[PDB]
């Protein structure tokens, strides 16, 4: 073994159209004696969207030269820019020609490159935007009576999104909502590119409670979102290898108990998933690319906020 790599492939997943994402790999000259002369080339059907950036190493500064001297036991660090310019799954090759010295013949190494142009982009409408979360208030609650409010999830991206909504009574202690008190409908759905879908919070505040029946309540809804193609890649990865979810996530993660495999509302029969090659890190890319939207839900009761007159307390300097 002459040349080693810390990565057998580079998989980018989704990058928005007109945007760019850098990824690196390290090549090591395994020889303790001999220097190799490497020629780095991008080839393949989507070579126009994978661009070699300047190379550096453990014994050399930044160079724009595609020809690299790699000294014995030197690591060189190769940078590839993924710059997609069309709504497609993309394949290319990093070709590493180890130039022959007659005594040793010419060996060509291949690192497959993959990614897709265009991504989902999820925002909420009909709710307040705070700095790092959204907020909605359900006013005029009455214990033992059903209240409904409607907000919207908008996908401003160029690809369909999955949306999985999970609600928490207490988010730190990870006590799920009783759906008979507060539930989200739909709680799992596919949202087409440049479309907006309505989501309903169905609020049935308990009249069983002893004391704080009309006390102002706070709940936390998490909307886990990402590219539908990413969820299809994830599905495909879990068929070939039964159990990968536990290994990857933290043991105490909320995502531990969330099903992304089962049928979502308005899921399509056709995606570009089969244009993407299966990779060992598809499950990692799925959870890695996933967004978490925070929606705080305040329940205000008529008797406590609406019916009580807000007056100035006892004031002194």
Numbering used by the authors: 1763 to 2079
From the paper:
CEP192 and CEP44 are proteins with a key role in centrosome and centriole biogenesis. We have recently determined the structures of the N-terminal Calponin Homology (CH) domain of human CEP44 and the so-called Spd2 domain of human CEP192. Both structures were obtained through X-ray crystallography at a resolution of 2.3 and 2.1 Å, respectively, and were experimentally phased. The N-terminal domain of CEP44 shares a weak sequence similarity to various CH domains, most of which members of the IFT81/NDC80/Hec families, whereas the Spd2 domain retrieves sequence matches to members of the PapD-like superfamily.
In contrast, CEP192 is an essential component of the pericentriolar material (PCM), a proteinaceous matrix that surrounds centrioles in which CEP192 exerts a scaffolding and regulatory function. The common isoform of human CEP192 is 2537 residues long and a sequence analysis of its C-terminal part suggests the presence of eight tandem domains that are similar to members of the PapD-like superfamily. The human CEP192 domains 4 and 5 constitute the so-called Spd2 domain that is ubiquitously present in all SPD2/CEP192 homologues and represents the most conserved region amongst them. Its highest sequence conservation is found in two motifs, as judged by multiple sequence alignment of orthologous sequences: Motif 1 (PLXGYGG) located at the C-terminal end of domain 4, and Motif 2 (GDEXXR) located within domain 5. The crystal structure of the human Spd2-domain revealed two seven-stranded Ig-like β-sandwiches with distinctive kinks (β-a1/ β-a2 and β-c’1/ β-c’2) at the edges, a feature that is characteristic for the PapD-like superfamily. The two constituent domains pack together to form an extended cradle-like structure. The two highly conserved motifs PLXGYGG and GDEXXR define the interface between both domains via an extensive network of interactions. Intriguingly, Motif 2 is found within a large (60 residue) insertion that precedes the C-terminal β-strand g of domain 5 and consists of a helix (α1) and an irregular part that wraps around it before proceeding to complete domain 5. This insertion defines a unique feature that is essential for maintaining the cradle-like conformation of the Spd2 domain. The comparison of the Spd2 crystal structure with the AF2 predicted model (AF-Q8TEP8-F1-model_v1) revealed striking similarity with 273 structurally equivalent residues superposed with rmsd of 1.83 Å.
